[PDB]
Write a protein that binds this ligand. Structure first.
Ligand SMILES: CC(C)[C@H](NC(=O)OCc1ccccc1)C(=O)N[C@@H](Cc1ccccc1)P(=O)(O)[C@H](Cc1ccccc1)NC(=O)[C@@H](NC(=O)OCc1ccccc1)C(C)C
Lengths: 99, 99
């Protein structure tokens, strides 16, 4: 699609058997999701944004279908008030910003 | 411009007599720029991101020439590490997410 930004760029994602809406984000290097029960081993890692830093669980090689497009990447899980799809996955579904 | 996301989407902006480089961000509702010198009255505002809540000086009606396109809007100035061009100006330069 072509998503104008008059409203938050939200899309449906399917990850670990669950359905969630996530923000398409060019200002996020990483994908960070709300806490869910995602199966597997996870290294600790910490990220920053405004306000500070949060501790997240790094899950790597997770498959996630963003708008029907599938991708596999690292997904950080942690206390975030919105789920975020960052550039590490946005490049796999072929996403470009245009103006 | 068509901008792929392998690299951070940074574009140059000319704001208040000064040259800056900022992040084109579809995950920011607002525009938040590094603490800088800008003329005007401001009102305190507070924004939230991950990790927490920063207090910022809110400015309305500031002209920003983003990637050599002009636009006028509210600009927040405060303790960020990267300047962000959020959706309140991204829609003025006509920007779209495309996949
Ligand atoms: C999502 C994270 C993976 C991403 N962080 C990240 O990429 O870290 C890079 C970094 C940081 C520090 C040092 C070194 C490197 C991140 O925090 N990105 C924000 C922009 C940014 C900040 C710091 C460094 C680089 C870039 P963002 O993607 O624009 C973030 C997305 C988001 C997170 C949480 C909640 C909502 C939305 N927006 C924001 O934080 C804006 N907040 C915002 O739009 O919503 C207000 C809100 C909504 C809901 C609840 C509470 C508050 C803010 C710029 C005003």
């Amino acid at each position: 699609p072509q998503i104008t930004l008059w409203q938050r760029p939200l899309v449906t994602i399917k990850i670990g058997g669950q359905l969630k809406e996530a923000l398409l984000d060019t200002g996020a290097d990483d994908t960070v999701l709300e806490e869910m029960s995602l199966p597997g081993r996870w290294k600790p890692k910490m990220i920053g944004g405004i306000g500070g830093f949060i501790k997240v669980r790094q899950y790597d090689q997770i498959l996630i279908e963003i708008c029907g497009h599938k991708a596999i990447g690292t997904v950080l899980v942690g206390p975030t008030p919105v789920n975020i799809i960052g550039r590490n996955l946005l490049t796999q579904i072929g996403c470009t910003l245009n103006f």
